[PDB]
Amino acid sequence: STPNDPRFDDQWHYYEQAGGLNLPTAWDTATGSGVVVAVLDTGYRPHADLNANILPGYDMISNLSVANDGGGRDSDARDPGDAVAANECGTNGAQNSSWHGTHVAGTVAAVTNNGEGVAGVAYNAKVVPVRVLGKCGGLTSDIADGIIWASGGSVSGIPANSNPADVINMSLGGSGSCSSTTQNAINTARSNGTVVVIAAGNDNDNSANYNPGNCNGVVNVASVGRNGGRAYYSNYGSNIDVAAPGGAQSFANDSEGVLSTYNSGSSTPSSDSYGYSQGTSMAAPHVAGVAALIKQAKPDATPDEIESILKSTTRSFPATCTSCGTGIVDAAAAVAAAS
Ligand SMILES: [Ca+2]
Ligand SMILES: [Ca+2]
Ligand SMILES: [Ca+2]
Ligand SMILES: [Ca+2]
């Protein structure tokens, strides 16, 4: 099926033969109904083309300066904006707000067939926003608590999650080895039945050396462009499980990117928008959305079974993708394999 959203045709990454996810055929069978995806990111804005698919979440950011919302941990996972001034994070230049989590969440589950905006990969799933990134990024320990809570595990001082996730998406990372705090959290999420999907990073380097994609028991995702070959920035290596479209842009908001829900604010939030972004951060929620399609078709699927289905049903690369996992995720084939 093809949705009626007016920007669907701009979302090449869902349907073109070279670099797309092969979604229309998948949507004949699965859309994510009944499945919950936790998006561990900067938070969200209640975009008109997203909010109906948002569930209550949690804000794990403990450092008040990073949190930028007046306090420590709290129940409102909305994104206040992560804009920074020059040298606020050390030696950085000034940066506008990313609205990264709004973009990622829309790839997972933008409201679809509403005649407005964009479509989402798992458009009948629901997203639990777990805010773990703010100004200058996020703390490993807050991210790890996010993983635990998102899965339905217990974190001291935090109310129980009433919407435990089937799938975690982490479009985030840094350099270096996977820490024990992170691996512990991942092990907890997997033991609770939650599959963990992670962006491999954007350093054009060996993915062995970038976390949390280098943790064990995760689905680590490389990025292809619209050509179906490796996006120039994508990490690559033996620990990549699969690839998905993350886009390959040559200027800001280039339509060669991945189009999703977004916000027009430079610092503070403003009007809803749609924007094209790129990264392994954009590839990961494609894969998280397919994991949700799989879980609708196979409700008792384990994390290892979901990873196996994703990896075993990929399609060929039409252009060079060295050490990009088994292939490009093929939503239709994955749903068939889970049915
Ligand atoms: Ca707070
Ligand atoms: Ca908050
Ligand atoms: Ca829409
Ligand atoms: Ca893996």
Residue numbers in the entry: 145 to 483
Reproduce text from the manuscript describing this model:
Previously, we identified Pseudoalteromonas arctica PAMC 21717 from the Polar and Alpine Microbial Collection (PAMC) as a microbe of interest because it secretes a high level of a psychrophilic alkaline serine protease.
Here, we describe the crystal structure of the catalytic domain of Pro21717 at 1.4 Å resolution. The fourth calcium-binding site is unique to Pro21717 and does not appear in other subtilisin-like proteases that have been structurally characterized to date. The predicted active site containing the catalytic triad residues (Asp185, His244, and Ser425) is located at the C-terminal end of the β-sheet and forms a deep elongated pocket. The conformation of this density could clearly be identified as a small peptide bound to the predicted substrate-binding site (S2–S3–S4). Thus, the final model structure of Pro21717-CD contains only three alanine peptides in the substrate-binding site.
